[PDB]
């Protein structure tokens, strides 16, 4: 059924699973036309497909050309997401295919279920969790590869860098959700915390800085403060 707080440990068992987030597939700037009407201009998007156990990110870049001369784009975006996810599963060898796909938004259930009719053994599941995967486009290297794309393109990342050498998936996923929740709530503050110390760099093959275990504890603390300080900055509470 639905993925929630009760069944959280299931994300880190040995059944291959993917999260699919479609929140950055269809992206627009809204602007005034010469005649004072409103129009949109699409920019490049991405499907965020993540194995929470391994950190393996399948970032399918959605080039603005996909939308050319199409109607009902917010609706097409869900079906395009489902088509690309189904094409990705079909491209993986059988033993690498997921046993479950968990969609971060319930409007993705029918489009993905219909695209995956050929895979009756793959379970399509909603989640009750409010996952901050929309802030993926706040990670500079992911934002850069999306915006520079001149055609449809799949880029493969490990969103946990080398963390699984030192911590479990459960802890790596908790660190990722904390970083993304922070970036989502106050992107400027969150980025300041991550890059303030010029001695700590990002390896060329990494997304996040090269923190020692003690430095990760300090960073994680600063992220939790930012999130509660913003929740007391908004809510008058």
């Amino acid at each position: 059924g639905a993925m929630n707080s009760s069944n959280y440990a299931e994300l880190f068992n040995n059944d291959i699973k993917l999260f699919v987030d479609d929140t950055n597939v269809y992206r627009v700037t809204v602007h005034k036309t010469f005649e004072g009407n409103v129009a949109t201009k699409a920019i490049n998007g991405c499907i965020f497909t993540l194995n929470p156990k391994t950190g393996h990110l399948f970032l399918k870049i959605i080039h603005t050309s996909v939308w050319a001369g199409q109607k009902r784009l917010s609706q097409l975006a869900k079906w395009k997401t489902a088509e690309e996810v189904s094409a990705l599963v079909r491209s993986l060898p059988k033993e690498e295919q997921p046993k479950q796909i968990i969609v971060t938004r319930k409007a993705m259930l029918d489009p993905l279920e219909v695209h995956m009719l050929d895979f009756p053994n793959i379970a399509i599941r909603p989640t009750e969790l409010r996952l901050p995967f929309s802030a993926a486009m706040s990670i500079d290297k992911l934002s850069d590869v999306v915006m520079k794309a001149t055609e449809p393109q799949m880029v493969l990342f490990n969103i946990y860098d080398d963390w699984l050498d030192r911590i479990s998936s459960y802890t790596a996923f908790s660190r990722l959700t904390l970083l993304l929740r922070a970036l989502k709530t106050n992107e400027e503050s969150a980025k300041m915390i991550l890059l303030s110390d010029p001695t700590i760099t990002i390896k060329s093959y990494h997304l996040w800085p090269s923190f020692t275990d003690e430095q990760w504890i300090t960073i994680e603390s600063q992220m939790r403060d930012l999130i509660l300080t913003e929740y007391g900055r908004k809510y008058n509470v």
Partner: protein
């Protein structure tokens, strides 16, 4: 004008004949129903005074043979039987009529309700949905499950309605996923009409039969089938104009005949709201939208 004689009425029972019904008392001298109109399928149905289960009946057509009812005290129900001896049957019916022991199928001359509810329903199509080829009449009851219901147990006692599933390979062409899911025209016109039913008459026959089993027996699987066949037309952008005009007539008379006090269990909110207000055919069912709005405005 045909007759279904009864041997006796040993147990107190509400007897239905099509849209009519009457109470018979335990051992009341009742010997059946006369003046049944030739040219249509009929249903005779039963609800025992002592049982809130035991709700059941027989689809028949008097042109196919001579049919009577006899109570079976072992199986505890009124059974339909065929009398093969024509002259014995004529002589039984003549005696009962002379002694005025038969109720009269009480049809108002102005009244086309039954024709309108059964316009496309044929006994030969009923017999393929019900399947008991030793009999010319078909037994249905409250509890019988559909083939679709059983896929999700006893196959011999099932309703063999055409399986309709919007999230099936049958419904969705590879590479036409979004198109076939949002516009079911392919599934309606090519798979169901041209492929399985052959024509709109067979499709409407099964739709009308599903409704009648839902209304007369409170058969849940028949109700699901009636709604599915309506939703498959309403969710199609491309439907022949004659099929839409005829659907509007069929649904009008079904909504008109539905007992007011069953519209809460027999009508699916989501399907009717979609069909009348959101779907491709939201502006195609004028008669059905006006009666539903005037009779069941709460549902919507």
């Amino acid at each position: 004008m045909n007759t279904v004689p009864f041997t006796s009425a040993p147990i107190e029972v509400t007897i239905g004949i099509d849209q009519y019904s009457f109470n018979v008392k335990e051992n009341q001298p009742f010997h059946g129903i006369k003046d049944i109109p030739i040219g249509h399928v009929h249903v005779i149905h039963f609800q025992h005074a002592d049982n809130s289960s035991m709700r059941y009946g027989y689809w028949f057509d008097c042109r196919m043979g001579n049919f009577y009812i006899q109570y079976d005290p072992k199986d505890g129900l009124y059974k339909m039987m065929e009398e093969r001896d024509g002259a014995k049957f004529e002589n039984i019916v003549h005696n009962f009529k002379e002694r005025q022991m038969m109720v009269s199928y009480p049809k108002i001359d102005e009244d086309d309700t039954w024709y309108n509810l059964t316009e496309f329903v044929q006994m030969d199509k009923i017999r393929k949905i019900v399947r008991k080829d030793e009999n010319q009449f078909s037994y249905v009851d409250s509890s019988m499950t559909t083939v679709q219901e059983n896929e999700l147990s006893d196959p011999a006692h099932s309703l063999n309605y055409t399986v309709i599933n919007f999230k099936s390979r049958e419904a969705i062409r590879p590479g036409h996923e979004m198109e076939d899911f949002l516009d079911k025209s392919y599934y309606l016109n090519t798979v169901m009409l041209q492929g399985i039913f052959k024509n709109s008459s067979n499709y409407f026959g099964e739709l009308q039969f599903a409704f009648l089993n839902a209304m007369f027996f409170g058969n849940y699987g028949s109700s699901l089938q009636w709604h599915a066949m309506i939703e498959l037309i309403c969710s199609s952008a491309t439907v022949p104009k004659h099929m839409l005009d005829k659907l509007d007539e069929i649904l009008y008379y079904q909504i008109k005949t539905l007992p007011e006090q069953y519209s809460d269990i027999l009508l699916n909110e989501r399907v009717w709201n979609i069909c009348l207000y959101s779907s491709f055919q939201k502006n195609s069912l004028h008669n059905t939208e006006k009666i539903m709005e005037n009779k069941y405005p709460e549902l919507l």
